[PDB]
Amino acid sequence: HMKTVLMVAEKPSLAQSIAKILSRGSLSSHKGLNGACSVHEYTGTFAGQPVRFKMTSVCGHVMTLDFLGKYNKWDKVDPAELFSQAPTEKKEANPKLNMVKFLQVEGRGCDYIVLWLDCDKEGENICFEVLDAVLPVMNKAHGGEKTVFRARFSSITDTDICNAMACLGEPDHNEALSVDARQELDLRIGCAFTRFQTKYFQGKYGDLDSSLISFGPCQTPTLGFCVERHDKIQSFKPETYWVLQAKVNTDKDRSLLLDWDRVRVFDREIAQMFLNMTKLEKEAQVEATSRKEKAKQRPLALNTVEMLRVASSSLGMGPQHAMQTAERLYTQGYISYPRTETTHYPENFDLKGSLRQQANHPYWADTVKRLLAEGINRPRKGHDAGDHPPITPMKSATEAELGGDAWRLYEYITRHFIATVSHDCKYLQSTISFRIGPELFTCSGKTVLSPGFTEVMPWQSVPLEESLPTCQRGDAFPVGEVKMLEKQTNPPDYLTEAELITLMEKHGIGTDASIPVHINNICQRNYVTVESGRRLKPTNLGIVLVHGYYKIDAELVLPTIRSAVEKQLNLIAQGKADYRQVLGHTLDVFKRKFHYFVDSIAGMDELMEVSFSPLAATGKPLSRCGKCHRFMKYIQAKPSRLHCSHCDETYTLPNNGTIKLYKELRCPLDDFELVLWSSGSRGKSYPLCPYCYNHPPFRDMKKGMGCNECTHPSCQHS
Amino acid sequence: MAQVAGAALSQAGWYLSDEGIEACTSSPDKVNVNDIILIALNTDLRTIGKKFLPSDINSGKVEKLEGPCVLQIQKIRNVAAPKDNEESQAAPRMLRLQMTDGHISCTAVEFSYMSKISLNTPPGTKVKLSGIVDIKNGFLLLNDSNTTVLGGEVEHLIEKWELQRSLSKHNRSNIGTEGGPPPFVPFGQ
Ligand SMILES: [Mn+2]
Ligand SMILES: [Zn+2]
Ligand SMILES: [Zn+2]
Ligand SMILES: [Zn+2]
């Protein structure tokens, strides 16, 4: 009798596509009892027997982690026993789908299972969840014969699904455990901190909503970069610099604008003497002329990081939106899996076939035809992490059959592929150096000799400039005018999405394409606003939260613990780590840090009272800030403070006494203006730096003691 | 003896005052110009010396510093870089050398690439200007053709210059403090 084999995909559309590819057209299909997934049947061969097939799909994740319910109530719980005392369970993950029961009834009679889940690390978790759901209801088999199978693939394309079938393997429990460990770590640490903060701040301040405060091992580190950029913006000190500019006349009308070698000078008198060296002179003598050939390198293969960066900077699409559009394009079968960190094409790749697919699109037609006619240039060598091939086209698409942002992303992916398999852009860089008086200026220009990839990527084309005059050495040219400028250095702009992607990739926080998830989380929670140019402007709530976190414990914000944890998860994935050991270690260190957070939450309560309470933020102005050069308000609450409105920071001052200005003098280490402390009854008063009283500059002195024992060789007051 | 030794010292270019020579002595029967040089290099220039720099160099009415004149560095600042970086390689570095004779303080500008003088040169380092050096609009112009770095090591103002190390005080992180947050021990194997 004919036996049966079962298949599971991550999406019903993927299930239908793969079933059509494998079944060669002949395919029965009917809807399941869940109302959202359909099952497809046909007849083929497995192992060495003629067998029936039964392919179905899941709806994303099938099981989601939470607590036992009794511990899920935030009102009545001790939000410190969620670390290593509260049990965890994967409950249902949208019980409206009844996926567990659907899988059980589908696999009620089965002998083999093959899982067509996404080949990312997250896919193995769903693979093993489906295995746990379906294993008890299948046949025990005669014994020893392999039953569970795993299909490895990167694109939903013909003969690619076939070669995935030809080399079936096994799932990776190490990757499944890595995903589970990450989920448990987040669900424990973030929920514990968020529950404690929600219980603490609840109706305490009028303008602060309790539910809007949250903490995460990744959300807080990725918000730290935005708040650090905001702090640099708010603590910028503009400085004036002077640039000399020389204009020379070539033949009769052309005016070359020469630029100075020294670029800039930050001293007005130095700029004045350099102009006095120059303004009287009425000739310029050319010294060196160089026309050297240079090549602009092709872009490497497209990975998810670069795809998100470009989709943000150029296409004006957010990280999560770009990820969803790329996943959809992969689902229909237009591009490969867009969760790749490899920028090097494998040797056994059909680059010529991929080029031949896009030989009819009007936009890139002549370039592809000439590339096929001549030889195909090898792509640049890159990183070979062993994941899927880079994000590359796999099927021809037109704006009519595609849509909007999806078509734009497909166009960028195809253009990147064509640029990778192309020639370098070649340009000559002409540099002419002039001597005016004792100074020497220069002028540079670029002339394109042969546009290579800078025809499929016009936005990377070398800008066109008029050719510099052909002047031999020892030629004298008239100079029209030379004058200095009064340019001022500009403050940095807010951190863009692409820059955030780069920073998260550099510091290690965010792996397995979770950076879009983290960015979208910190955008949905109103901590950053997406201003024009895709700029992440931190909000008041986010700034105050991260400043309080930094005040209490820097490692809660800095991207070090998360980087180490993600590295240990990677070693979990590559079979060399202990899941229990790493989970316990991380839970223990974060439990100690949470105990310190509870015992030292007073620092955060202060910045929240002066920021989110309108009836307790009014005070008399006092000594300047040390980062802003702006007045700081002196609050008369029980924990007497010193609040700066520009930079959202507060400084604690001694109680049971008065605070008065100390003759405008300034601390020579932090730039803050030090104030005196009158200790009640008639007696001595000692100086006190507002920033040093809260953040000591030396290890020996602890928090909350003034310049009486400042332990500083400078700061004469000590 | 002592007088001809001082005359040879002046000819070599260390314009010191007779009080300075009498302060920088050896066994009081014979002193050698090498000994005076060695003692002076370790001695701050303000304590000893005389006045050969005219009291008009900062005014701008002079344009010549003829003579092998020895001066002492008091402060180095990169004028091609802003006060927040001091290391940005967006412009060739040019040094504003504050130099002194112990009596009148003058300023010079690095008109070329002087590899001998760097931003880490300790204050009190002695610089000898030889041949003809040109003043214009205040500042001197200095390059390799006339400036020689004659070592220099004077403990009190090098310890004062240790305020450069004191300036780099990024230790204000509250990590590892006795009364501070628990530290993150690195993961084991
Ligand atoms: Mn997935
Ligand atoms: Zn401020
Ligand atoms: Zn201070
Ligand atoms: Zn002090």
Author numbering:
A (entry chain A): 0 to 717
B (entry chain B): 1 to 189
The authors write:
To study the structures of full-length TOP3B-TDRD3 in the presence and absence of DNA, we purified the human TOP3B(Y336F)-TDRD3 heterodimer from HEK293T cells. The planar assembly of the protein complex exhibits substantial positively charged surface areas on one side, which may enhance its binding to nucleic acids. Three Zn2+-binding motifs within the CTD of TOP3B were well defined, but the fourth and fifth C-4 zinc fingers (residues 718–815), as predicted by AlphaFold (AlphaFold DB O95985), are too mobile to be captured. Different from Zinc finger or zinc finger-like motifs in E. coliTOP1 and MtbTOP1, our structure reveals that TOP3B’s CTD establishes intramolecular contacts with both the core and an extended loop (residues 168–190) of TDRD3.
Type IA topoisomerases (TopoIAs) are present in all living organisms. We present a series of cryo-EM structures of human TOP3B with its cofactor TDRD3 during cleavage and rejoining of DNA or RNA, thus elucidating the roles of divalent metal ions and key enzyme residues in each step of the catalytic cycle.
